[PDB]
Ligand binder design. Structure first.
Ligand SMILES: *[C@@H]1O[C@H](CO)[C@@H](O[C@@H]2O[C@H](CO)[C@@H](O[C@@H]3O[C@H](CO[C@H]4O[C@H](CO)[C@@H](O)[C@H](O[C@H]5O[C@H](CO)[C@@H](O)[C@H](O)[C@@H]5O[C@H]5O[C@H](CO)[C@@H](O)[C@H](O)[C@@H]5O)[C@@H]4O)[C@@H](O)[C@H](O[C@H]4O[C@H](CO)[C@@H](O)[C@H](O)[C@@H]4O[C@H]4O[C@H](CO)[C@@H](O)[C@H](O)[C@@H]4O)[C@@H]3O)[C@H](O)[C@H]2NC(C)=O)[C@H](O)[C@H]1NC(C)=O
Ligand SMILES: O=C(c1cc(OCC2CCOCC2)nc(C2CC2)c1)N1CC2=C(C1)CN(C(=O)N1CCn3c(n[nH]c3=O)C1)C2
Ligand SMILES: [Ca+2]
Ligand SMILES: [Cl-]
Ligand SMILES: [K+]
Ligand code: NA
Ligand SMILES: [Zn+2]
Length: 805
């Protein structure tokens, strides 16, 4: 119930929301069917439109007008945005030369530069170049301020998940908005685009910026706008708020545009109908900037121009139907379109089996345009699993396609030519970022970055302490002139042991054998030196990783590699080695094919054993430092140490052996040497965080040897590839992966072929940031470089995406 008989007189666009049954006058009252009777008349005036004309200048105030051109309008804060241009001979902001804003130039009474966040739905990154002729205001913000060539959204590349990530700095799995449509089985409730359930606060987790601000005594404009409030009125409301007295005036504001997304769905991302919507958004930006200039705020406010996601060409004919794969199609519920999410239609159906659904959807048609996954097997870079609202079964849909349950769903609902939602590394889904103002840098291009990073920067711009989030605070310091956040490296929690030779060969009863019984003072001191770390500077280039949790581990040195060996997990946490451009690849000699050697530095009780692998008929083993890249025949024996062995399914060893025997050398050739850090990851509860021992669901049969869920590599080299990886004076270049440790290669439809036709494609799909590996391992990398810590944080957030330009 709403008592709509109250009045909006003196309350239009009031900041504090009043509670039912009282009638509302705030910018969302329309959306709740709750505005007072006179809200349109008083608060949505349209008379005479949005622009001053010559003949209105100096008019007698008529309060019915949408905006004013009377002499008192600046003092009232309600001039049309072009007033000073039309009536006082001023220039539009866009027509003024770019001049560096070295310090905030603010009116008296402003405690800090306000922040205005201008968000555009479906604004694809390439619009900045392709639409540049029709967007002069936005182009000036971009060229004069700080910009990235594109900003990476979160998956799924839908509106509400991305807007709420922008608001919180959280992955969707953490903030809870995991799609535009959702079912929560605990609540037994559904979230939809249409209707009232989506306003219930229980959907919305984390702490969005407007709450962070309010908690810390920074006032916020209302961030949301009912669809029928026209853009010109939204801008005028912002500008009116900015004339409030100091103690009532917000410091942070948000404007949201439904365009260009609305037209892009109808016309495709580059339909000829798209020029007008881009022009219209640019005009709105011009209104805001002119309005700020009238208020003498144009060199005071920080403006962010940001998109949620891009837009791809997608038509009704490019739809795959689950009815062409499944016999049982009426027993499932599908969330459809540019991603798929599948669950049982009835919880009372005991004949529901995810395993048979997955199998029926795997590599069934030669050109199949989606791939099924159990959510825990999705690429870890998506961070799309740890929420009860994400269904166990997921379909990753190819760009340009949809998935639907049955054909009747597509025509009892062609209309559309554009859509979005796909994998957040897809070029068409990339969006935009521009920052302009005193706190942003001047005429500065920054590398592409992820939208999860922006909440921290928005907090930095407002003097707020961010709530705990998934950004890496400091990684975006290079965007800012001032207000940078200067973090310290985390403290190492566990110090390593440095064991020497402590065990005789016969103390080991591991069931391992090696043909290594082959016997010199010249070369005897040299092998002693290698075991004490004489080559460590070559193979450990950026210092040892720090262990950020409590555990027992040993540093082990070798001629060709160094490792941190966990006495708890019985295997290395990390293995570090350097491969020069000139390194040679060699075979595993015939006589050493099954060689595994006890390590006389590590007790039998803290070692793996070969008998377990013999008895486990599903599990085999691999090595972290590759025997193929040994520096010499003698050094090769180190690679067969029991301390370098890790459990590997045979199906995964195909992947791993190709990476080690072929790809590492390829990268060293291309990059002028590489440094590799490889290791295991355990994430059985798919939370993106290192498992404790008591979370491990699988061991090598009969043993305490834990089975990794994934294997990582971090591959570092010199950004200036004229310098070798091991003598690099400047910035670094990195690519990383987190490969799923799976007992089959069902993910790779072409896996019956030679590894050269499918393995690198798998690895590209599972590309990762160093920071992703940090979360999954409790390790901190790059602790000892010549580089600034903020630059290192930026490096750790880098993702190598493998898309063209
Ligand atoms: C990305 O960044 C985020 C933010 O930093 C990271 O997420 C954090 O990670 C922590 C570890 O997973 C986690 O800490 C736990 O919090 C528990 C209390 O949580 C409530 O309070 C906070 C603070 O206000 C609130 O934000 C939480 O919000 C979640 O839940 C509500 C719904 O209830 C959602 O609306 C919201 O979206 C959010 O959901 C997300 O997180 C939860 C987990 O909290 C997931 O389950 C959801 O799927 C979703 O992803 C909560 O309202 C706290 O009680 C925990 O303590 C347990 O573990 C400790 C170990 O230190 C142990 O000492 C205790 O014994 C305790 O265990 C007991 O409970 C167990 C479970 O019932 C039980 O099994 C045991 O036997 C014990 O009885 C714990 O400290 C933190 O909550 C989240 N925060 C957020 C916002 O998500 C995220 O990790 C980052 N991701 C990456 C990849 O880096
Ligand atoms: O006002 C907001 C808004 C604005 C908003 O800013 C958060 C800011 C935080 C800081 O960084 C800048 C962003 N945050 C929210 C939610 C997340 C808290 C909401 N609205 C969004 C939408 C509205 C109005 C209507 N609409 C819609 O019907 N479609 C649903 C269907 N859909 C759409 N486009 N394409 C498509 O499929 C959009 C989407
Ligand atoms: Ca985990
Ligand atoms: Cl969705
Ligand atoms: K075996
Ligand atoms: Na296969
Ligand atoms: Zn859309």
């Amino acid at each position: 119930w709403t008592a709509t008989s109250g009045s909006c007189k003196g309350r239009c666009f009031e900041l504090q929301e009043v509670g039912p049954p009282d009638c509302r006058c705030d910018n969302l009252c329309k959306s709740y069917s709750s505005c007072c009777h006179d809200f349109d008349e008083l608060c949505l005036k349209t008379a005479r439109g949005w622009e001053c004309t010559k003949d209105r200048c100096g008019e007698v105030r008529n309060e019915e007008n949408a905006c004013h051109c009377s002499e008192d309008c600046l003092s009232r804060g309600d001039c049309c945005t072009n007033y000073q241009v039309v009536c006082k001979g001023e220039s539009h902001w866009v027509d003024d030369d770019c001049e560096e804003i070295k310090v905030p130039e603010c009116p008296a009474g402003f405690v800090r530069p306000p922040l205005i966040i201008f968000s555009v739905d479906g604004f694809r990154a390439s619009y900045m170049k392709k639409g540049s002729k029709v967007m002069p205001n936005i182009e000036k913000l971009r060229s004069c301020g700080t910009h990235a060539p594109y900003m990476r959204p979160v998956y799924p590349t839908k509106t509400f998940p991305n807007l709420y990530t922008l608001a919180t700095g959280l992955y969707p799995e953490s903030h809870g908005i995991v799609g535009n449509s959702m079912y929560d089985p605990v609540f037994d409730a559904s979230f939809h685009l249409r209707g009232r359930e989506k306003f219930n606060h229980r959907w919305w987790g984390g702490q969005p910026l407007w709450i962070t601000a309010t908690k810390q005594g920074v006032r916020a404009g209302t961030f949301f706008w009912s669809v029928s409030i026209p853009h010109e009125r939204r801008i005028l409301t912002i500008l009116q708020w900015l004339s409030l007295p100091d103690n009532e005036r917000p410091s942070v504001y948000a404007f949201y545009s439904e365009q260009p997304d609305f037209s892009g769905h109808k016309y495709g991302p580059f339909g000829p109908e798209m020029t007008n919507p881009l022009r219209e958004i640019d005009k709105t930006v011009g209104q805001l900037m002119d309005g700020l200039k009238q208020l003498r705020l144009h060199r005071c406010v920080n403006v962010i121009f940001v998109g949620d996601h891009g837009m791809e060409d997608v038509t009704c004919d490019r739809t795959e139907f689950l009815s062409n794969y499944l016999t049982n199609v009426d027993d499932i519920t599908l969330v459809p379109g540019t991603l798929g999410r599948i669950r049982a239609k009835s919880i009372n159906n005991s004949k529901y089996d995810p395993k048979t659904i997955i199998a029926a959807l795997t590599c069934k048609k030669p050109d199949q345009h989606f791939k099924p996954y159990m959510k825990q097997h999705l690429p870890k870079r998506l961070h799309y699993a740890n929420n009860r609202r994400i269904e166990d079964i997921h379909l990753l849909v190819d760009r340009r396609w949809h998935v639907a349950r049955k054909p009747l769903d597509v025509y009892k609902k062609c209309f559309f030519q554009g859509d979005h939602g796909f994998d957040n590394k897809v070029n068409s889904m990339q969006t935009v970022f521009v920052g302009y103002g005193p706190t942003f840098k001047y005429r500065t291009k920054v590398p592409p970055f992820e939208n999860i990073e922006l909440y921290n920067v928005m907090c930095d711009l407002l003097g707020l302490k961010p709530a705990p989030n998934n950004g890496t605070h400091g990684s975006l310091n290079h965007l800012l002139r001032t207000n940078t956040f200067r973090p310290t490296m985390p403290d190492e929690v566990s110090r390593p042991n440095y064991p020497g030779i402590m065990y005789l060969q016969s103390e080991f009863d591991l069931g391992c054998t090696c043909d290594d019984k082959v016997e010199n003072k010249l070369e005897e001191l040299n092998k002693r030196l290698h075991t004490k770390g004489s080559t460590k500077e070559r193979h450990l280039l950026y210092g040892r990783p720090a262990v950020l949790y409590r555990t027992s581990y040993d540093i082990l040195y070798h001629t060709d590699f160094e490792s941190g060996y966990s006495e708890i997990f019985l295997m290395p946490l990390w293995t570090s080695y350097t491969i020069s451009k000139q390194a040679e690849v060699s075979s595993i000699p015939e006589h050493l094919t099954n060689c595994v050697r006890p390590d006389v530095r590590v007790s039998p009780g803290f070692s793996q054993n070969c008998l377990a692998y013999k008895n486990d008929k599903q599990m085999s083993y691999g090595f972290l430092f590759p025997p193929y890249l040994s520096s010499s025949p003698e050094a090769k024996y180190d690679a067969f140490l029991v301390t370098n062995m890790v459990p590997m399914y045979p199906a995964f060893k195909r992947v791993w052996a190709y990476f080690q025997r072929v790809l590492v050398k390829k990268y060293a050739s291309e990059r002028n040497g590489v440094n590799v850090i490889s290791g295991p990851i355990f994430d059985y509860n798919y939370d993106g965080l290192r498992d404790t021992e008591d979370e491990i669901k699988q061991y090598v049969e009969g043993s305490s040897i834990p089975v990794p869920t994934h294997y990582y590599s971090i591959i570092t080299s010199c950004l200036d590839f004229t310098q070798p990886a091991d003598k690099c004076d400047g910035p670094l270049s990195v690519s990383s992966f987190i490969l799923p440790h799976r007992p089959d290669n069902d993910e790779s439809c072409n896996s019956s072929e030679d590894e050269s036709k499918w393995v690198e494609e798998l690895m590209k799909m599972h590309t990762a940031r160093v920071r992703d590996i940090e979360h999954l391992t409790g390790l901190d990398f790059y602790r000892k470089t010549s580089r600034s810590y903020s630059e290192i944080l930026t490096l750790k957030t880098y993702l190598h995406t493998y898309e063209s330009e």
